[PDB]
Structures are given as structure tokens and as C-alpha cells.
């Protein structure tokens, strides 16, 4: 329309309707110029990578992107509460975006002083990409996402992908991708974008625990009708061998016939917060569990959604199979257990075994009266029919889906990480500032223009989802277990900004609270 | 044909907000131990976590189209894999499809 | 208790603010939130007009009421009114009692 009238309205509000809710955000955001309006080919081999795990290529494009899809982006602290404790279950089902109000600015930096001027004529030109034709990076848990706190401006991430490689050069499958080759739309101020996104169908996130775990299904009362061999030795001395066999009871369970079995199991390595009780060595690299693919090792982080601990054992954490979150100010590297939020998985003990523990045993020979009977261990187990696990748990700071790579076959699609997996996820948002040169030179010349103004975009995004919600329907007597901010008294007021103006999460929140049978 | 591998899904330009424990031993040298942990990033990648994970794998025995590097002997019936049932051996022919070479 | 209309539901706050907008970005992406902006602030003009319900004197009285009056004696200024700095000052509190009533 015109550079006096607003594009749009700040709508923050979230709305609680009684099977399904609607949170809109919005936020401040500014745009830089990426790559000097370049493509680099980015590879390994510009900055060290010594090591074939770590070889990639790919290419960096001026382009940047929104990335809304960790969930403190969507709810506030109370708002995620009001989730937690009331609700089963969740899923997306609608999602609508917005790009309003914005400003273009050049900057001119002589003798050191620099003054910021307003581009009327300039444009930011956006896209979204509907049909999934580009490499999808959302779903793979990187930075650059809306602040958890509706005050922040934010930075926009910039945009890159990798390609096959064989070491850092390029195999000739590699492809490379022309983002300009994409038909977008181009905003002046007075413009706006916007664009609605319907979630296909996802299973609902399951919040809830379990009251009752899965090896105890049964009547304590009554016997089994079921028998199994009890005794296989008569006596002590030569010769002495029988067959007994006995009810399965309530005197001796654990040895009872079920129809079920807990979830598969990968294992991981155990490591205590306590530092005395950890072995003296680097076993961090090499005592960890891997998966290779072509030649290349990449580490597990997040496999089976597995029980972080066993029992009250609360000083050990799996080596890669736990996230692992910064708090507030956090360190890049080498930082102190303290430091770091280390997440706790131990809701799902009742259907999914420990992590740091073997599936099971299983026998190894043929037991004979020469042969004694010997049993090895199970360190990894992949399904057996009559399976049942659950998936790992939604937190703030985790990420709300991922894409489901398009493939042949895939089993259970549900991210490891966590969320909601999708092959048609809510597309990307590229954004870009369009190029304006400098003075071109008089004579003509065949060479691209090099020389630009320097120039950076500003503007506010709206992004409202439409959840839907699976409400308690629980028969339980006795109070649940709730998410409470602790009474006592503290110098700061938990997700509450700081003196200095800092926002933080102390801690992360899970979503399982309330409970259902299993 | 993926015109991108499994483990390299991941904007490269981008750090995760994700930690791993990178080193184990604060240095060498006796009671020595600490936890510390680092941002999985473009510098170290491989370490970084990822939503999903490659197929499932029933491991054959390797040998070359180049006579002199097998092994002089007879590996063939003997070192193949196989899955038995009912008491029969059936040597196991086109399984999970898995990539025949490496690189 | 200090005078006034006591009200549930007062007419509401009415807050202003004028959106940031922020310096150059960096070049490089970088975490952090955005410390730096522009200078700047805003001014216009507000138009707050009430209605009021007034209940006019019915009084029978028969000898003159006590107004409120400016007295009649020459000073250096007048009252509610300019100083030659250009300062306007209230002389005095005026309070709203004036008229009488029967108990």
C-alpha cells in the first residue's frame, strides 16, 4: 500500500478453546546480507577437517530462513503448564505465518562514522518452498530460532546444504541448487506476506506416564493357569535329574507367561555426574556407540527412546543417548557439568528398557549331559513381534517436528530426537534483500558487479498453530504429580528476566506428568 | 539417487543449541576426571544428533574381482552367510539391500 | 481513602511503546540477541474527552451562598494564569465544597 500505513497488527495472544488451542507469537527480526550476494562451496578442506568422519561439501547461499519449530518459541512457561498438567496428548493441526512492516536500510561507514538510512525503494524478496524441491534443514535441531522471549530481536540464520563428497571433493550425483531459481514474491515497505500450512495427520504426543509398568499386568491375587518348569534337578548328587514344573504366581512372578515385551534396545555407555566413579581415561570418542554409514562413523545421539537410568540411580546419564541443553550464557566449548542441562528420560522405565543396560540374555548352546547350559548377552535388540515402546519426550527447548526422508521404507517414523515426524513438514521461509549495486562504471565491461551497498532488512513475523488437544478422561483417585514453581524464596523469579535484562530457563520441561495404564 | 547422504542432513553454516560430552579426562595425570561439554557444530560434525538413522544390516563376507587379495582357501560355502531353518542351512542370497562397496 | 471515584473496573491503561529497530546486523550469524539500536523516539497528540452527569443545586434558601472567587486586588500577576517566564502555576487548592445542603 503505502510507506505511511501499517502493514500489520502486533497479535500475540494465545486462546484456550476446549478441544484445541490457538498460540499466536510475534516477534522483531533483521535481516543481514549474507555471502556478499554469493555462492562459496563450503567444503571441509577450507578450515581443517582431518578426519574422514567429519569431511563435507556443500554450498552457502545469501539466503536466510525462518526457524520457529523448538517449542518455547509457540508457549510461554504458563502456557506450556496449562498444556502439560490438563492434557494427554497434542498435535499441530493448522499453521499460518505472517511478514509485515518492513524496513530496508542502508548504511554508509566513512572515516569510521556511519550513518543509517532508510531505503524506501529497496525490497526483501521471501519464499516459501511448497513443494520440498531444496534440502530441508529445519529438521535437524540448529540455532537461529524465534527467542523464547517476545521482547528479543532476533538475528536470521543464514541458509546452507551439503551434498555427496567423496573427502572434500564433490561426486558427480552432487547437486547444486540456484535459490534465486525459484519464482518469489518481492516486498517494499507497505507490503506483506503471508501464507497458511495444513499439518497432515500425526499420531498425538503422548503425555502421560505410565501407573503401571509393563511387567506387571496382572491380577496379584490369582494364579496363572500356565505352568513352567520349576526344578530341572532332583537332588544334589550323581544322577539326580527330574522335570518339575509349577504354577506361575503371585509368589513367584518375573517368571510368569506374558503377552507383551518391552521396546527394542541399543546400548549405551554409562557416565556418573559424580567424577570419582568415572574411569580415569578418554573414553568419551571411542567407548561411545556408533552407527556407520559409508566408511563414516557418526556417534548415536537420541537412538531407541530408552530409560535413562534404572531405578533411583539418579548419578549416571547414557553417554550420547540423553540431550543435553545450555543454560542461559553458556559456553561454546569445554564447558562444566554445571553448566550444561542434562535431560532425564526416566518417565518410560514401565515400557522401554534402561539405556546403559543388555535387552535381555539369551542362551548360547545346546545344554547336554556333558554340555552345562550357557547364556551370553543381548546388547542390542531390534524388534521382535508383541513389541511395545514409547517415543522420547517433548521438552521447551526441543524441536517441534522433523521431515521423514523419502525413502523405499521407514519404520515407526517418529524423529529420535523427538516430535512430530512429517513427510510434508510446514515449508521453508527464505528471505533474502534484494542486491542494489553501486555506480557501475561508464565503459561498458562484461564482468558481474561486484560492488553493492550495504543494506540490512527489518520487520515483524507472525506465527500462529492451531493445536489439538486430548483431554484427561482419568478415573484415578489419589492427587497426579504436577509442574509447580517451588515456593521458597530465590533472588530471581524462575523464567522471569534477569537484572541485567537477560532472559533464562532454569530448567527443561518435560511433558510427561500425568499418568494413564498401561 | 539421494542427491544428499543420511548423515549429512544439517545446515552447515549453523551450530546446534544441542551439547555432547567431549572430553572425559580433565588431563593426564592421575585423579584426573572431569565432565566438559561443547556445542555440536560444522567444525565437529558426526557427533552431532540427528531425527533418524540408516537401515537395517545382515553382514556378508567381502571378496575382490582381483584374484591375488582373497585369501587362498575355500571360503565360499564355508564363510557365507546363511539362515537356517528347520534344520536346513539356506545360504542367504540378495538380503536387506545394502550397499555392495564402500567409497 | 485520598478522593475519587472508586471503581471495579477503572478505564483501562492505555501503554505506548515505540517498536526497536535495530543497527546493522553482523555478517555472520551469531546467537545472541541484538543489543544495538537506533536512537529514536516518537510524539503526537492525545484527545481525552469525558462525559460527566451533573446534579444540579435544587436549594430553597433564602440568603446568599458561598462561591469560589478570584478577590478582586491588584498583584504583580493573575492567578491560574502565565507567569512572564512562560511557567503556569495553580495559586491555590480548590476544593469542591461549596454549596450547602440540609443534613
Known sequence: DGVGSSSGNWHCDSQWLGDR????????????????????????????????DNAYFGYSTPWGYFDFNRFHCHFSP????????????????????????????????????????????????????SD??????????HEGCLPPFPADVFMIPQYG????????????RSSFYCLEYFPSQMLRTGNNFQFSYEFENVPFHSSYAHSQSLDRLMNPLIDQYLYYLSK???????????????????????????????????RQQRVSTTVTQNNNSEFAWPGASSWALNGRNSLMNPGPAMASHKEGEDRFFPLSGSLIFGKQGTGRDNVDADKVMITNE???????????????????????????????????????????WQDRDVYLQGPIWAKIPHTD??????????????????????????????DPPTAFNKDKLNSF???????????????????????????????????????????????????????????????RNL
Open 21 to 52: 488451542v490457538i498460540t499466536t507469537s510475534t516477534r522483531t527480526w533483521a535481516l543481514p546480507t549474507y555471502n556478499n550476494h554469493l555462492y562459496k562451496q563450503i567444503s571441509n578442506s577450507t578450515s581443517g577437517g582431518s578426519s574422514n
Open 409 to 438: 521404507g521407514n519404520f515407526h517414523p517418529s524423529p529420535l530426537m523427538g516430535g512430530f515426524g512429517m513427510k510434508h513438514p510446514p515449508p521453508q521461509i527464505l528471505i533474502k534483500n534484494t542486491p542494489v549495486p553501486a
Open 232 to 266: 530341572t534337578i532332583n537332588g544334589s548328587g550323581q544322577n539326580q535329574q527330574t522335570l518339575k514344573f509349577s504354577v506361575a504366581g503371585p509368589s513367584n512372578m518375573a517368571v510368569q507367561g506374558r503377552n507383551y515385551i518391552p521396546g527394542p534396545s541399543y
Open 161 to 172: 546444504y551439503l551434498t555427496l563428497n567423496d573427502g572434500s571433493q564433490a561426486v558427480g
Open 132 to 141: 520440498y524441491q531444496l534440502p530441508y534443514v529445519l529438521g535437524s535441531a
Open 78 to 129: 504458563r502456557d506450556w503448564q496449562r498444556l502439560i498438567n490438563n492434557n494427554w496428548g497434542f498435535r499441530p493441526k493448522r499453521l499460518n505465518f505472517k511478514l509485515f512492516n518492513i524496513q530496508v536500510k542502508e548504511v554508509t561507514d566513512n572515516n569510521g562514522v556511519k550513518t543509517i538510512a532508510n531505503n524506501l525503494t529497496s525490497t526483501v524478496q521471501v519464499f516459501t518452498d
Open 453 to 515: 551497498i550495504t543494506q540490512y532488512s527489518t520487520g515483524q513475523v507472525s506465527v500462529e498453530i492451531e493445536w489439538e488437544l486430548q483431554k484427561e478422561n482419568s478415573k484415578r483417585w489419589n492427587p497426579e504429580i504436577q509442574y509447580t514453581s517451588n515456593y521458597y524464596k530465590s533472588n530471581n523469579v524462575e523464567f522471569a528476566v534477569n537484572t541485567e535484562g537477560v532472559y533464562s530457563e532454569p530448567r527443561p520441561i518435560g511433558t510427561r506428568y500425568l499418568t
Open 346 to 388: 526416566e518417565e518410560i522405565k514401565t515400557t522401554n528398557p534402561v539405556a546403559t543396560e543388555s535387552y535381555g540374555q539369551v542362551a548360547t548352546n545346546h545344554q547336554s549331559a556333558q554340555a552345562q547350559a550357557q547364556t551370553g548377552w543381548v546388547q542390542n535388540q531390534g524388534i521382535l513381534p508383541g513389541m511395545v
